[PDB]
Design a protein around this nucleic acid. Sequence first.
DNA 1: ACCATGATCTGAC
DNA 2: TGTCAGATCATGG
Lengths: 259, 249
Amino acid sequence: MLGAIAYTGNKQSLLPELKSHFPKYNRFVDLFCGGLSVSLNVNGPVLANDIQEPIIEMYKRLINVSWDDVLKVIKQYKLSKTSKEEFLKLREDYNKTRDPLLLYVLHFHGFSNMIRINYKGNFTTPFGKRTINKNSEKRFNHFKQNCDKIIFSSLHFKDVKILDGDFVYVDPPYLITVADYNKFWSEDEEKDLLNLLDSLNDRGIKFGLSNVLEHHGKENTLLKEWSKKYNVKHLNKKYVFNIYHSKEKNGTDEVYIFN
Amino acid sequence: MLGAIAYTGNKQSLLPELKSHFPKYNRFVDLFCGGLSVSLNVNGPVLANDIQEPIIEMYKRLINVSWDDVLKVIKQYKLSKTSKEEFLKLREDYNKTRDPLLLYVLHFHGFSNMIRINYKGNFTTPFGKRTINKNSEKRFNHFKQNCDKIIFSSLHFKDVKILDGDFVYVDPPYLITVADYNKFWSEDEEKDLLNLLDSLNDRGIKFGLSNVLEHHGKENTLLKEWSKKYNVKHLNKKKNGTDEVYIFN
DNA sequence: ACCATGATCTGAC
DNA sequence: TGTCAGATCATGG
Ligand SMILES: Nc1ncnc2c1ncn2[C@@H]1O[C@H](CSCC[C@H](N)C(=O)O)[C@@H](O)[C@H]1O
Ligand SMILES: Nc1ncnc2c1ncn2[C@@H]1O[C@H](CSCC[C@H](N)C(=O)O)[C@@H](O)[C@H]1O
């Protein structure tokens, strides 16, 4: 299922499986929305939250722009797969003005359609010899067709108010796998997240957590044990199969921990 | 439309457009059949010819081969997308025995399925970290379902005996482009091809020449001029600066 | 490509 | 026999 934008570690492929395990609810809370592949494909009302505010402001702005408004900007900066000079100009403009729409047009031309913003709030992703494709507005239309049920916010996960009747889906960065957004993570942040879930559990709040217990040779010991306190499902078909025809130093172990 | 095997310069994309120009005929002569994307997909009877004997013999052998036979050889050698040493072993066996079935199985494991025969007849394509796949099956099934109307030939084009009522389709190596089989072409070879087509005309025989008049700056001009004599269609669509043409009488 | 994913193919660079 | 974005086709949320 499509997400609003390309995004490292998205759940487009896993969404269908994850939904099957989702409970019934009065309000859905996507604590770490990211590219929204989760928020866009569940029943509302939805609360999509993410720490990276510049990205949330882009979503808030997308709600009121047409594809034409987007093509108008691409035509204005004369952007193409070979327009490095113009890509740099557009990047400079966004870094100064912080026009949310200019950021959306930027990602379409950056390296791997990735959005890398430093602490100063500026876009550092290099040109990617890319541009919109005959399927770029497919995501855009998916977003427009499902944004009406969503309420965005850009707060640190700790500051989000969870209420009775809500279901909390958590998909934080993963220490064991590389990802630009790892910069916002540390062991400390994870402990607070883990502490936070237990609370919702003791408050009659159902939640769901995505993560990886193992990868390439490392492991998240602390989480491995913590998870034994709930219901666990191993989503990576390859890791599951090789447990029986294994050698040892193999791949990733994707899971969905839900109370 | 698929050919019998992947092949650089195949006409799988152009065949539909080309056929709308082909006449009726008593016999279709595919002078430079290559991967057979044309031969397997036109009404027969057909005469499929190519100068590369190894490939033609592979086709001749293929007629008497079942997919399970292909799989038996793959098990026997234990090939896979990571079996580089077993690939080298199969290649060595083919090079010594020259058995066509081994070539067929071997080409599925080489880079882009390319069949590169060197100066002494040995297969030298590098391992391609790949093996058979659904396309392999599809092409094989397509060959078996359409090989009945074809008679194969492995001769230099000037040696093939063309008859009355024949339609001679020719898709030779293009001077302007790059292909491994260009080592068989040259200005002189092309000169004689154009002379033969003229003879076919003098005899009242229909032919169709696929080719390139312009590609990457370079241009073929005796062909441009020689073209003025007959009908020409430009198929350059969607690929850039190239000017794919079809010259027929 | 079609609903969407993903394996594979192919034409620029 | 490199890289890879976009296209093609098989099939499974
Ligand atoms: N303290 C924090 N609070 C909320 N979100 C945080 C955070 N630290 C990092 N993140 C967010 O963690 C997200 C992990 S990616 C989650 C991906 C998402 N489910 C999808 O399908 O695309 C990033 O978007 C990052 O901005
Ligand atoms: N002198 C010659 N006589 C016959 N065939 C020749 C030749 N010199 C080169 N060739 C053959 O020219 C072919 C050009 S490729 C033609 C491709 C074919 N229509 C397809 O759809 O696959 C090659 O297969 C090459 O072996």
